[PDB]
Structure 1
Amino acid sequence: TLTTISGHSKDNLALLKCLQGETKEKEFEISNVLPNHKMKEKLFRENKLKIDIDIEKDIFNYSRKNIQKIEFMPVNRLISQSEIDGIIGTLKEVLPTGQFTSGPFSKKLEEVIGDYLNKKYVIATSSGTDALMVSLLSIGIQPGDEVIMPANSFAATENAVLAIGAKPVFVDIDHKSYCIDPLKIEEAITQKTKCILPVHLYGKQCDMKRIREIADVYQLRIIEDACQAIGSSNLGEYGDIIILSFNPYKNFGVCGKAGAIVTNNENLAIRCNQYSYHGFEVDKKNKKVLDFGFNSKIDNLQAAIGLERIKFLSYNNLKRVFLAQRYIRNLKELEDRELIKLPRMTEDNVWHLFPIRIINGRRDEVKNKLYQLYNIETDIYYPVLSHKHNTKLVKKNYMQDTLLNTEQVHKEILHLPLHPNMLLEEQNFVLEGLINVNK
């Protein structure tokens, strides 16, 4: 059997299983798409998998290095010297053009992302938050319309809804994946509902087939917040619009803010292009066709940087899967002792963040002791749920919201350090602290 590695999550899992010998005798080709550039250089030779790959020594550079502390996300570790060298090279080409607003690198990155997501239209934006705002306007959202969404996403998700005067309507999450529960969506639909905004939180996809079945009964649009899920196989199959972020701390990021709007719907894509640049007709600066818009296209310079950094995406995603598997397998004893709950390995997760649940009310004690006793930073993405801020909006509108699963899980969740440039010695340091703090 010969498989072409596409650079998405499903084929990364198949490749990992082959590298670890959990596989039938299988052979691999690599697709020559830009998100596979680093993987092809590092792991392939003459379009075949290198025979002498050792994951720990060659991909993770394991050398028994001594580790004394762990930070959750040291941002200097998220960019490699290889990426820097390439970024300097492409900046030497972009800077003399003087093209610093739109330009040819913006168009090229839109084509690359369209090819990678298998979608016809891409509008590269100045942020994922801006992409969401523009996408909501493009489907016709007016002030007062309702948008069904979960209450456990980053603030940007609700903020894009609120900034255009729409109303978040919060629905509880499921019991297995941190994602909006499809079985609770229909009961929140009102005559003001215009959109369902699922979030593919932590890099895991929501159950989109069920959500689309509901949307189609009520003639609702679906805008997917995929800002943490780049690379996830079949992303967007059922969505009207998919939102990406290329923030520098995402699985793929530029060196500043950026994002994208992805869709097969030409009418929505046109309206997104118009709203993302002042309401002007496409390529007609200063001539409005829509009533207003924003200044929200990507910078050409960041698109050039993105075309260099995206070369590392499938390889960095593979490294993330390996780290996730290694946490799951080495922490299983704590789950058998009913002290924690672990995520499961699935083919869609791109492992932007690695959640566990500490049950029996011990999450705060374990988090605090990991730091104070073991010098391990962990974090809680995110520390306050949407309906629990001390804002006038919440106090006037969301005081009767009860989201029982969301609120219970929020007492238990903890995120462990997971970023592709981590050393396995560093993950071992986290693993030993987690074991010791739970003896």
Structure 2
Amino acid sequence: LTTISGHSKDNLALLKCLQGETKEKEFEISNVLPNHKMKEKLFRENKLKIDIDIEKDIFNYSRKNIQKIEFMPVNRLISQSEIDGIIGTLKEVLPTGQFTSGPFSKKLEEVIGDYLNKKYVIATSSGTDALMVSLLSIGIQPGDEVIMPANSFAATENAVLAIGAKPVFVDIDHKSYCIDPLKIEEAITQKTKCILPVHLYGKQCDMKRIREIADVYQLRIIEDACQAIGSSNLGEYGDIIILSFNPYKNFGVCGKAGAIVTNNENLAIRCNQYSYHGFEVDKKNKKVLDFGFNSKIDNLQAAIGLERIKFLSYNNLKRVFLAQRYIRNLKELEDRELIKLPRMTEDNVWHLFPIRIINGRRDEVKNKLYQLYNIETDIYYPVLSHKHNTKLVKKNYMQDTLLNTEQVHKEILHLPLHPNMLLEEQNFVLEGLINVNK
């Protein structure tokens, strides 16, 4: 038996079974809220349905004619089932008038804490705000230094900059796009207070070694897990874990929201206080901290969150199926040394699907795929943090050289992958990818 908890490791186990590679594995599903859709869709009397065809039942394969591919059409991220359920919960929340704090905010924090196996959760107004509050709660002061990679979304460095701290950029691992633990200790000075690893594209960093370093220098760890919800054993070594529930993440609400996650009650208390004006917990208009933000989640978005999180494990399952299909159908382009593919691992939730186009062919392939084959691809993110055309960069990061980050930035390309894409759509992408690499 394996008991599907809704995390990446179990989903990868379930996928190989749904394709039949299992050894008569008894699967059962935990009835937690992130499994709600999966349990309705694939299970029947707490056992896998006998009659599951992935292509027909899960992806609705019907040989539809495809003429163009967009990378992330927003209208396909939400399903009619989601919408009907959201309307239902809004009709319950709206009459209450509780539109700031509320019971749905607290229910979502309980759900997230259970899902992540962490004691304390502060649901926030965005992942960016969660990070800012979290930096403040560990005691970050203006001029303090925060070690971080240079290839994240701008929010990561912005949270550090917004409170007057100093990003110190460290090179990545070319094997995982994650910050390299072997280069972290070199960057530690008297001014560093925090290491800020990013679980980029849905894959986790090598957190075990970072913790060992963090303990020797007595540094805090705040993990940017804004793209990594559902990854197994997420946050085992972190002081604080940051989540984002923006509508584009593996799990989103209908608007902006995020969360702070921790087992450390002292940090949890300060985060709750900083996220709401410095007021003592649930003592509005009475400050104990010097200041704070207006950064807790909306009760209404928490209620939408509790409806949409029902689809999380199922949508992550569709994501891992799509990623494996890309890997298996592009392998010969890798054997020809034209591209490098990601490897299937049990922690990746496949928020984004990166490949590397080597021999300097990335720009030609991206541009031809769009201009010739009507296929959008994207580069997350087009500019590295030490390379923005800002006054901050020109004064502080001109001499920054991040060898692996910069090299892989010239090769990276992200392929369309979202849980409601058709297999005919992925076929379109796959054939363009193959045709342009003849």
**TM-score using structure 2 length:** 1.00
Q: Deviations over 1:117-154 (max 9, x none)?
A: 00000000000000000000000000000000000000
Question: 1: CA distance between counterparts of 2:49 and 2:40?
Answer: 10
Cα-Cα RMSD: 0.4
Question: 1: CA distance between counterparts of 2:39 and 2:253?
Answer: 21
Question: 2: CA distance between counterparts of 1:86 and 1:25?
Answer: 35
Q: Deviations over 1:399-424 (max 9, x none)?
A: 11100000000000000000000000
Q: Deviations over 1:157-190 (max 9, x none)?
A: 0000000000000000012000000000000000
Number of residues of Structure 1 aligned to a counterpart in Structure 2: 438
Secondary structure of residue in 2 paired with 1:29: strand
**Paired residues of 2:239 and 2:263 also in contact (CA < 8 A):** yes
Question: 1: CA distance between counterparts of 2:106 and 2:18?
Answer: 36
**1:371 shift after superposition:** 0.3
Question: 2: CA distance between counterparts of 1:156 and 1:248?
Answer: 15
**1:212 shift after superposition:** 0.2
Question: 2: CA distance between counterparts of 1:12 and 1:292?
Answer: 43
**1:23 shift after superposition:** 1.6
Question: 2: CA distance between counterparts of 1:222 and 1:412?
Answer: 30
Q: Deviations over 1:10-39 (max 9, x none)?
A: 000000011112221101110010000000
Q: Deviations over 1:298-338 (max 9, x none)?
A: 00000000000000000000000000000000000100111
Q: Which runs of 5+ in 1 are unaligned?
A: none
Question: 2: CA distance between counterparts of 1:10 and 1:390?
Answer: 41
Secondary structure of residue in 2 paired with 1:331: helix
Question: 1: CA distance between counterparts of 2:211 and 2:20?
Answer: 38
* Residue matched to 2:121: 122
- Within-5 A mapping of 1:125-140: 125-140=124-139
Question: 1: CA distance between counterparts of 2:334 and 2:21?
Answer: 23
Secondary structure of residue in 2 paired with 1:432: helix
**Paired residues of 2:151 and 2:381 also in contact (CA < 8 A):** yes
* Residue matched to 1:108: 107
* Residue matched to 1:195: 194
* Residue matched to 1:261: 260
**1:279 shift after superposition:** 0.2
Question: 2: CA distance between counterparts of 1:25 and 1:305?
Answer: 38
* Residue matched to 2:312: 313
**1:106 shift after superposition:** 0.2
Secondary structure of residue in 2 paired with 1:281: coil
Q: Which runs of 5+ in 2 are unaligned?
A: none
Secondary structure of residue in 2 paired with 1:326: helix
**1:194 shift after superposition:** 0.2
Question: 1: CA distance between counterparts of 2:37 and 2:22?
Answer: 24
**Paired residues of 2:174 and 2:405 also in contact (CA < 8 A):** no
Secondary structure of residue in 1 paired with 2:410: helix
Question: 2: CA distance between counterparts of 1:119 and 1:266?
Answer: 11
**1:294 shift after superposition:** 0.2
Question: 2: CA distance between counterparts of 1:256 and 1:191?
Answer: 40
Question: 2: CA distance between counterparts of 1:159 and 1:175?
Answer: 24
Q: Deviations over 1:63-85 (max 9, x none)?
A: 11110100000000000000000
**Paired residues of 2:201 and 2:227 also in contact (CA < 8 A):** yes
Secondary structure of residue in 2 paired with 1:49: coil
Secondary structure of residue in 1 paired with 2:129: helix
**1:428 shift after superposition:** 0.2
Question: 2: CA distance between counterparts of 1:36 and 1:23?
Answer: 21
Secondary structure of residue in 2 paired with 1:244: strand
